[model samples]
Target: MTYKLILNGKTLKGETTTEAVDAATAEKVFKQYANDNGVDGEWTYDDATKTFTVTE
Candidate 1:
Protein backbone atom coordinates (compact mmCIF):
# COMPACT_ATOMS: atom_id res chain seq x y z
CA MET A 1 0.00 0.00 0.00
CA THR A 2 1.02 3.54 -0.64
CA TYR A 3 0.35 6.42 1.75
CA LYS A 4 0.93 10.07 1.19
CA LEU A 5 0.92 13.34 3.03
CA ILE A 6 0.53 16.57 1.12
CA LEU A 7 1.43 19.82 2.81
CA ASN A 8 1.45 23.44 1.82
CA GLY A 9 0.36 22.71 -1.72
CA LYS A 10 3.15 20.20 -2.19
CA THR A 11 3.59 16.47 -1.99
CA LEU A 12 5.76 16.63 1.11
CA LYS A 13 6.01 12.96 1.89
CA GLY A 14 5.05 9.50 0.78
CA GLU A 15 5.64 5.89 1.71
CA THR A 16 4.96 2.51 0.21
CA THR A 17 4.38 -0.23 2.74
CA THR A 18 3.19 -3.78 2.66
CA GLU A 19 1.46 -3.53 6.04
CA ALA A 20 -1.46 -1.65 7.44
CA VAL A 21 -1.13 1.45 9.62
CA ASP A 22 -3.53 2.54 12.29
CA ALA A 23 -4.76 6.12 12.40
CA ALA A 24 -2.48 7.10 15.26
CA THR A 25 0.60 5.76 13.55
CA ALA A 26 -0.34 7.48 10.31
CA GLU A 27 -0.70 10.76 12.16
CA LYS A 28 2.64 10.29 13.82
CA VAL A 29 4.32 9.71 10.49
CA PHE A 30 2.62 12.73 9.02
CA LYS A 31 3.79 14.92 11.88
CA GLN A 32 7.30 13.68 11.42
CA TYR A 33 7.13 14.74 7.80
CA ALA A 34 6.06 18.20 8.84
CA ASN A 35 8.83 18.36 11.42
CA ASP A 36 11.40 17.24 8.93
CA ASN A 37 10.25 19.98 6.60
CA GLY A 38 10.74 22.55 9.40
CA VAL A 39 7.02 23.38 9.54
CA ASP A 40 5.96 21.30 12.51
CA GLY A 41 5.23 24.37 14.61
CA GLU A 42 2.90 25.71 11.97
CA TRP A 43 0.58 22.79 11.33
CA THR A 44 -1.38 20.04 13.02
CA TYR A 45 -4.33 17.75 12.46
CA ASP A 46 -7.32 18.44 14.67
CA ASP A 47 -9.41 15.33 15.00
CA ALA A 48 -12.18 17.29 16.70
CA THR A 49 -12.37 19.88 13.98
CA LYS A 50 -11.24 17.55 11.25
CA THR A 51 -8.90 20.18 9.94
CA PHE A 52 -5.25 21.11 9.60
CA THR A 53 -4.40 24.44 11.14
CA VAL A 54 -1.43 26.60 11.69
CA THR A 55 -0.53 27.07 15.35
CA GLU A 56 -0.71 30.66 16.40
Candidate 2:
Protein backbone atom coordinates (compact mmCIF):
# COMPACT_ATOMS: atom_id res chain seq x y z
CA MET A 1 0.00 0.00 0.00
CA THR A 2 1.05 3.60 -0.64
CA TYR A 3 0.17 6.92 0.90
CA LYS A 4 -0.03 9.83 -1.46
CA LEU A 5 -1.29 13.38 -0.87
CA ILE A 6 -2.36 15.76 -3.61
CA LEU A 7 -2.70 19.52 -3.69
CA ASN A 8 -2.93 22.07 -6.48
CA GLY A 9 -2.43 19.32 -9.07
CA LYS A 10 0.84 18.34 -7.40
CA THR A 11 1.51 15.30 -5.28
CA LEU A 12 3.75 14.09 -2.47
CA LYS A 13 4.49 10.45 -1.78
CA GLY A 14 5.95 8.50 1.09
CA GLU A 15 9.04 6.35 0.70
CA THR A 16 8.66 4.07 3.68
CA THR A 17 6.70 0.83 3.41
CA THR A 18 6.09 -2.50 5.08
CA GLU A 19 7.16 -3.72 8.60
CA ALA A 20 3.91 -5.39 9.59
CA VAL A 21 2.04 -2.21 10.37
CA ASP A 22 -1.64 -1.48 10.11
CA ALA A 23 -3.77 1.62 9.44
CA ALA A 24 -2.37 3.36 12.51
CA THR A 25 0.89 4.69 11.04
CA ALA A 26 -0.57 4.91 7.58
CA GLU A 27 -2.99 7.55 8.78
CA LYS A 28 -0.33 9.23 10.87
CA VAL A 29 2.19 9.38 8.05
CA PHE A 30 -0.39 10.76 5.63
CA LYS A 31 -1.30 13.46 8.10
CA GLN A 32 2.36 14.20 8.68
CA TYR A 33 2.97 14.28 4.94
CA ALA A 34 0.81 17.38 4.59
CA ASN A 35 1.97 19.12 7.75
CA ASP A 36 5.65 18.55 7.07
CA ASN A 37 5.38 19.54 3.41
CA GLY A 38 3.20 22.63 3.98
CA VAL A 39 -0.32 21.71 2.91
CA ASP A 40 -3.17 22.20 5.35
CA GLY A 41 -6.76 21.33 4.55
CA GLU A 42 -9.43 18.74 5.00
CA TRP A 43 -9.20 15.88 2.52
CA THR A 44 -11.51 13.24 1.18
CA TYR A 45 -10.19 9.77 0.43
CA ASP A 46 -11.86 8.03 -2.48
CA ASP A 47 -11.64 4.27 -2.31
CA ALA A 48 -12.84 3.87 -5.90
CA THR A 49 -10.23 6.04 -7.59
CA LYS A 50 -7.67 5.33 -4.84
CA THR A 51 -6.74 8.98 -4.28
CA PHE A 52 -7.05 11.91 -1.90
CA THR A 53 -8.96 15.04 -2.80
CA VAL A 54 -9.18 18.57 -1.41
CA THR A 55 -11.54 21.37 -2.37
CA GLU A 56 -10.27 24.77 -3.35
Candidate 3:
Protein backbone atom coordinates (compact mmCIF):
# COMPACT_ATOMS: atom_id res chain seq x y z
CA MET A 1 0.00 0.00 0.00
CA THR A 2 1.02 3.63 -0.60
CA TYR A 3 0.20 6.82 1.23
CA LYS A 4 0.58 10.42 0.25
CA LEU A 5 0.76 13.57 2.32
CA ILE A 6 -0.24 16.88 0.82
CA LEU A 7 0.58 20.05 2.67
CA ASN A 8 -2.40 22.33 2.95
CA GLY A 9 -2.23 25.29 0.61
CA LYS A 10 1.23 24.23 -0.46
CA THR A 11 2.61 22.58 -3.54
CA LEU A 12 4.61 20.00 -1.65
CA LYS A 13 3.81 16.29 -1.85
CA GLY A 14 5.38 13.41 0.04
CA GLU A 15 4.73 9.73 -0.46
CA THR A 16 5.69 6.42 1.11
CA THR A 17 4.76 2.80 0.58
CA THR A 18 4.59 -0.30 2.72
CA GLU A 19 3.61 -3.93 2.42
CA ALA A 20 -0.07 -4.88 2.58
CA VAL A 21 0.15 -5.61 6.22
CA ASP A 22 -2.44 -3.41 7.96
CA ALA A 23 -4.10 -0.03 8.00
CA ALA A 24 -2.52 0.85 11.32
CA THR A 25 0.93 0.47 9.84
CA ALA A 26 0.02 2.48 6.76
CA GLU A 27 -1.43 5.30 8.82
CA LYS A 28 1.51 5.24 11.18
CA VAL A 29 4.02 5.58 8.36
CA PHE A 30 2.00 8.26 6.63
CA LYS A 31 1.43 10.19 9.81
CA GLN A 32 5.16 10.53 10.30
CA TYR A 33 5.37 12.81 7.32
CA ALA A 34 2.33 14.74 8.50
CA ASN A 35 3.82 15.20 11.93
CA ASP A 36 7.17 16.23 10.48
CA ASN A 37 5.63 18.80 8.17
CA GLY A 38 3.02 19.91 10.69
CA VAL A 39 0.45 19.09 8.10
CA ASP A 40 -3.08 20.08 9.14
CA GLY A 41 -5.26 19.44 6.17
CA GLU A 42 -6.41 16.85 3.71
CA TRP A 43 -4.62 13.63 2.77
CA THR A 44 -5.31 11.09 0.05
CA TYR A 45 -4.15 7.53 -0.39
CA ASP A 46 -2.85 5.94 -3.54
CA ASP A 47 -5.05 2.95 -4.03
CA ALA A 48 -7.79 1.87 -6.33
CA THR A 49 -10.37 3.55 -4.15
CA LYS A 50 -7.96 6.22 -2.88
CA THR A 51 -10.43 6.89 -0.11
CA PHE A 52 -8.31 7.66 2.93
CA THR A 53 -8.88 11.23 4.00
CA VAL A 54 -7.62 13.33 6.94
CA THR A 55 -8.43 16.87 8.00
CA GLU A 56 -7.12 19.11 10.79
Best by TM-score: 2
Clashes of 2: 0
Give the clash count for model 3: 0
Residue 40 in candidate 1, Cα distance off native in Å? 3.1
Report lDDT per candidate: 0.47, 0.52, 0.55
Write the residue-wise lDDT of candidate 3 on 1-56 in tens digits.
Answer: 54444344354444344554666677776677667766667656546643345455
The TM-score of predicted model 1 comes to: 0.43
- Least lDDT summed over 10 consecutive residues: which range in candidate 1? 11-20
Q: Candidate 2: give its CA RMSD in angstroms.
A: 4.8
| Model 2 misplaced regions, further than 4 Å | 9-25
Local lDDT at 13 for model 3? 49
* TM-score against truth, every candidate: 0.43, 0.50, 0.46
Candidate 3 deviant stretches above 4 angstroms? 1-11, 14-16, 42-51
Q: Can you tell me which runs of candidate 1 are displaced by over 4 Å?
A: 9-20, 41-56
lDDT of 2 by residue, 1-56 (tens): 65444554245433333221544455576666567777666777664544554432
